[PDB]
A paper describes a structure:
In the PT-based defense system Ssp, SspABCD confers a single-stranded PT modification of host DNA in the 5′-CPSCA-3′ motif and SspE impedes phage propagation.
We then determined the crystal structure of SspER100A, a mutant with both N-terminal GTPase activity and C-terminal nickase activity deficiency, to a resolution of 3.48 Å. When the structures of the NTDs of SspER100A and wild-type SspE were superimposed, the CTD of SspER100A was observed to have an en bloc movement of 2.6-3.9 Å toward the NTD domain. As a result of this conformational change, the R404- and R408-containing helix moved away from the NTD, yielding a larger space for DNA. This result was consistent with the observation that SspER100A exhibited a DNA binding affinity similar to that of SspECTD and stronger than that of wild-type SspE. Given the conformational difference between SspER100A and wild-type SspE, we next wondered whether wild-type SspE underwent a conformational change while functioning. When the flexibility of SspE was analyzed by normal mode analysis, a computational approach for the analysis of collective motions in biomolecules, an intrinsic vibrating motion between the two domains of SspE was found, resulting in its conformation alternating between an “open” and a “closed” state. Strikingly, the structure of SspER100A resembled that of the predicted “closed” form of wild-type SspE with a root mean square deviation (RMSD) value of 1.724 Å for 622 aligned Cα atoms. Remarkably, the GTPase-defective SspER100A mutant bound to pUC19 DNA as strongly as SspECTD, whereas SspEK40A with enhanced GTPase activity bound to the DNA substrate with a Kd (22.2 μM) comparable to that of full-length SspE.
Numbering used by the authors:
A (entry chain A), B (entry chain D): 1 to 771
C (entry chain C): 1 to 221
Write the structure that this text describes.
Amino acid sequence: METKEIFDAAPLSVSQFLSETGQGLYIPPYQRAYSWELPKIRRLLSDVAHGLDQLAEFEDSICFLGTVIALRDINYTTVEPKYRSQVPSKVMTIIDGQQAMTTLLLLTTVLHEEIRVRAEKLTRDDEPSVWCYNQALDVTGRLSNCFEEDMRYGEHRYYPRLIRSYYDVWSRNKGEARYRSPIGYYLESYGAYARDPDAVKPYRHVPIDPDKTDGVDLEAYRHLDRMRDQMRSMLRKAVGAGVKREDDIQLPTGTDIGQSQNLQFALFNSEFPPSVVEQLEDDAKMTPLTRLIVFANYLLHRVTVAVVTAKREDYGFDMFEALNTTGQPLTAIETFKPRAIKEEGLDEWQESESKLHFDVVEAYLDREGSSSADKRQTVTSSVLLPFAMFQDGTKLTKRLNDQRRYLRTVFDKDPDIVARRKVLAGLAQVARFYEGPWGSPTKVPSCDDATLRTQAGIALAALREGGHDIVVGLLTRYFAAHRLSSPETVESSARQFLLAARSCAAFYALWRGSFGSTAGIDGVYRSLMTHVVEEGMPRFARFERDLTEVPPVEALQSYLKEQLRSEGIYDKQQWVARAAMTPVYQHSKPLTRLLLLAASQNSTPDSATPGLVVRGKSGLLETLELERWNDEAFATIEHVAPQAPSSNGSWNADLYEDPELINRIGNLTLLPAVENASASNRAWHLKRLMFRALSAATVEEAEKTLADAEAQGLRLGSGAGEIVRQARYLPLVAALAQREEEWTAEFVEARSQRLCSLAWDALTPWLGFEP
Amino acid sequence: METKEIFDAAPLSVSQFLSETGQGLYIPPYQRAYSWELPKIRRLLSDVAHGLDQLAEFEDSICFLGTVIALRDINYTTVEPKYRSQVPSKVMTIIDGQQAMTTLLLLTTVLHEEIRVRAEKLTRDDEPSVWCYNQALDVTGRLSNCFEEDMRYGEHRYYPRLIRSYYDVWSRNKGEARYRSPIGYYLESYGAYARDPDAVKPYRHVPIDPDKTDGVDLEAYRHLDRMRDQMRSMLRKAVGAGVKREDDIQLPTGTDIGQSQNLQFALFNSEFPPSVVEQLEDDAKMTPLTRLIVFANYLLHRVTVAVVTAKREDYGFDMFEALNTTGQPLTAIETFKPRAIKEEGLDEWQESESKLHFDVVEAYLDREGSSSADKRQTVTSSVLLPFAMFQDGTKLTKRLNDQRRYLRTVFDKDPDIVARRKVLAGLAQVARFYEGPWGSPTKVPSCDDATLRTQAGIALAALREGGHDIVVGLLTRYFAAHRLSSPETVESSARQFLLAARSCAAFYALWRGSFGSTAGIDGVYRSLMTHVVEEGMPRFARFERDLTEVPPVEALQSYLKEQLRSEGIYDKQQWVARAAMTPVYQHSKPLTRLLLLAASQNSTPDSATPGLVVRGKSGLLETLELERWNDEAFATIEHVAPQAPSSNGSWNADLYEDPELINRIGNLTLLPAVENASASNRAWHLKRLMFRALSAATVEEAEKTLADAEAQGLRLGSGAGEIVRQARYLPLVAALAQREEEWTAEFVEARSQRLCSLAWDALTPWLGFEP
Amino acid sequence: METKEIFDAAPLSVSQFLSETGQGLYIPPYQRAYSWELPKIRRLLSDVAHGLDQLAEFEDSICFLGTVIALRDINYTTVEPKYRSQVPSKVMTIIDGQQAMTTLLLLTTVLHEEIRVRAEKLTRDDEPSVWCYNQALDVTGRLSNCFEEDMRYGEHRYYPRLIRSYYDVWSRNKGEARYRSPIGYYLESYGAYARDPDAVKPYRHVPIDPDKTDGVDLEAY
């Protein structure tokens, strides 16, 4: 008695864990039911998908999957409704991980379904096609004995794994056998479906309680069933179409597989026959299935869980406790500091560039982290992905090992010094960038061009609010060059940077203006940072090379435009066509602010059409100024027609057959003061008056219309907010007080058309338009 | 590649982990410095001490200590400034647990220190004495080769364990060996002290940097040095004096050890010689040693750490991550539901007494827990310690295994059912007490005596604020009988209960009033729930028995009084002597509220001495009503003489010779409206005026004195808060406005004396005083 | 119960085998006496010498020594006249191999003797010579904790390894400790010589029965 067993750990692939010939995984009777909301599931699939994708590169990288701590219940004292007659020969009552475990088994069930049915759609006379048929069969069987295990006799001849006590008893005889838990039921019913002779139809599922089983919540069954089916969908959508939405689950492609030898050996113990690397090179009708098979094999043999087996139940609990108190793993920066202490040069570094740089990074991390520990890591990620754009041009992930690995890779490229401490200077400049124009954008840099300063200042403050960190690469890349240049070429830098800022705002506004989403833009900027620019002169995002240098000022503009062609559309007609019909308030409200501010650039109320607006005053009151983003003069996105009219205060239902109408530009303006809090809103008459208040060019009409609207009750809430003697010029709201008629739907169409045309006119000079 | 090592875990006693003959534990160069603040150290020691204490009971209970994950650095690739000639033959660069480890080594250092020098004070001529010296010798050496290790030649012939990289190189040669980290330095110098012949003094310690080593913080050495010396002091204060403060670290006593066969077998592989159990039974100069020796021997052989070993470093980090994802260990109530599902009677329970009870308990936990997870266990403790008082009479600890154990122990005594499901009715009733009079005390029970209701209501609302949960047993015990009674004996029950509440408030009011602390009270109430009361009629806290029955109504009072004797003092004279001189505001502020509301019970401003108060109005305005605790009429504790007077606003330093003066009754009253928030305070004149304001019995003295004090400025902060036409009677503030003279210390003593006498008068009838 | 331990095998070097911080190797009482006539000893030594010679060439070649099968006597049911007060904490009654083990301990004893005494003839002032003294020192001790083990108090403070039942009781106390078997007595006496200060004379050996011990044959001795 000292280590007298107590406990017992080993690593196992999901295949060797799940498919052990005489085993049952048993959910003991104090566990909650299945929880994991889909986000955890997606992190799950995407971790294994990343492990596999990184297996092509690193031939030994093994991906982990957590721990399961379980009781090797030897005298079956924990299987609480049991038929000892024939309980399985090794039951493992699962103390923790039982959730991950449930998820896994289901994942196998979906993988089995797909690989089977896609494998039957296979033309078995192609030589490669038959290979892919054979290989599918293989994985099919190997997923088969992964979730069920063939006891040899009886009805209910097959046992699941995972079971829950109380609902579900393992047995193979004809009475007496239940599988009524969510996971128990699911595994039974899938398993029986798989054994349908004459099957090959995809899996339906007939959820339970034909008239019974309220020993669980009925809500639990709903959840588990839904989880399984949504992984089924996730995976299905991961090899199929081309919509390729940002998350999804990226597993390597037909060409990827086809050309990675190491992936081939480590998952099929052999090199592919050449006819298959050919058929794969261009997906060719069998590659979705083959991608599903590669992913399935990786899941079997290369995702490994840590299995901790105690012999007594109480030791198991004490173990659970002892492993819940296990320290605070460190950011990839911390675990990487050594590897540059150990290049400067020996250990004698304290007045040595890298220290300074690192001190910078470290300052930022302690400043903006500190508060907790995963806040510290969320900050380290914020300074690490933009850098991965910057000093290399690759999309870094939010998983620890990746930040560790990429940082190793990049630091150990230019194996010298002066080069390596430039690599560190990158990170430093990035943290300082986040301190300058992103803390309070008003610093930007210096330079004259006093319109440029507050114009790129609006660009930044709008890029910050509402995501678009994909840009923080580029801009830091440029923000670097303003501090790295022969004291003469400060002013050149200051301009390039400022223009870049402005151009990235515009392309932001356009790209999300027309489409509904950050659709490609991240990947488009990624291509921008990799693509060859002007023969061999440079590369877009400082890539080795030399920090000060590269690219120019403007190759951004032309490339971004060249892409605004393609699947972008950039003719004001085509563009305003797309953008007039996209709910901008539904997306980012800061996008809609930028767009409204760009559509009211030195603008004036239109007379020919009452309620539109037109330009032409060169410098009336130019709004694309950072002092006017924050300008809480006019700083509220007010819908003309409200989103909520639950009993219809009146209004025109023209506007609501299509619920995206209420959310286009033509339905919004920038209203000072009140939103929906102090004094605001009503139905389109009180709204007309409210706009009519804020538009008068004399107080011998401001006081007058303040009183005009107090009859119906303009002083709503008390006695009107900051509403007595308001000056202030608001061109959109003017020609909105000038429209009587009514709030027709056609009018929002023409209005959003008008505003988009104006904003496009106002901004497209920011990419310097001629394409 | 499937289990290709990846990792490799085992359990080891701290002795087998630390003192393996060729091993060196290495703190790699990215670990933080030594963190562990003293709360965590105290948890560590009490964890092991609890382990020992529970080994006496259960001869097999093995105690854990967490995990250490380390890289078995095989080619010394992580020993970052090294001399391979003689790096140790196995290094274990610790990826996680290194802080746990640092503490562990320090602990061995102190246990070795104490056992060394105390064993020298042994008269070795005495048989038991020599057994003890020998036993000391054994553990001494076995701790020694625990922290350092004998390489066999050269200066620096001895190697530490734990080392930190960069600072510290293991070697044995004469230049070249450094141990300059905090721990490196500590283990070196401590061991050097241990190897001093002609020593046997206790260890002084000379912290580092005779003029150097400023690659670290200088605070690092400070924290660690201090932490060691305080584990030293902790243990010293665990076997030495008799102060026995609430925390300390409880390890078993000479007799405890002396009589537990299992403790001796399991730590000394043999039964003690009887001459030793004899000398031990009554400490006798040698028992502190043997308690320290037994503590160290349990630490050595029965604390077991989980050791996880990777061969690659990145496998180590990925493992660490995979173990930071380790579930949410469950409340002892969850893990106990099964074992009462399986006595009711079989699995057919859904309409079967116990279900009811659990539903109660579960509901309460789900209601007020919920929000988080450690809130859920905190709430499960709040219902389990008082339950442990009710159905048994024991102090449960807040630790998981103890709750599990006690729940199993208690539930399985009377092995029947109706005995057991009564045991469960216990828990349910504790939850319901938490739902009746503790959620809002205004429920109380039914009954007439409508004065009992608000009197016991202030009792409860006063016991709740300011801790004093030790009572929750008793009262629940009673609250059950009010809900379980032959429909006639409801009003009897209802009365017992209400009076019970009052009594506990009174005893509470008294006990912390006279003492400075809840010194005995916990033990006193535990004594009551165990003490035999009236032969074999019942037992004070339902102990098996039968829920409705027991105890009486009033044995509470008699026992509480009988103990108010002993080390209590209860003669009005003696009690006011103690209580006049205990700064009650320093202790629990609800204690001062209870005392002032009892001291102003229909109280009247005293004329004979300007500023005291005297009683006698039987029903003037009686304050001991739950309606008057919340009564934010008079609900602000105002010090007459302020706690803040850093430069003396003027005031009298007579009161500040003793910092406990400012916080006695005689400097406090109950003030309405403002504390120090709206309009408040100043120097003793303005304070006089403020008291004179609220005491006006006419409006033509209310307004007149409102303006009087605005001359000096009563409207402080803006213009006097809720201060215009205030009726409201506060007898204390009048005779505080009736003292001119000055605010002397002699007067504060007299005033606190008077108030204390009065409150004692008001309350001691709540225990039905005659003793 | 299918592999429920039954058995348990591993390789260990003679160092990590012999010098386990808390182990005692016990010759159970049905084993014959020490037999190995000198040719078997000579093979033992030439095997270890050959393995070492073949280590220069093949940097990985590891040399074996046969097998020991032993019972991890956990409740000390086989240590036949025992003082449980202080039996070693882990005994291993050798079921097979006890003769190879007898030889091995004897081998360490003579290697310790030679390296010790030749290292004292070292002029400790010569760089290599001091390199070589230290190195002797290292090995010397690392062979000591190989054959005996320092329980930490009493007379008969040191425990052998290997012991035979009936003859020989591990204890560290002053009555009550016997070592009278051939090997028990040898390792005891050798250990004593080793720990002699002021020695560094080669080992004589003053064999048993100052008047006693015909509980074995005297020929075995």
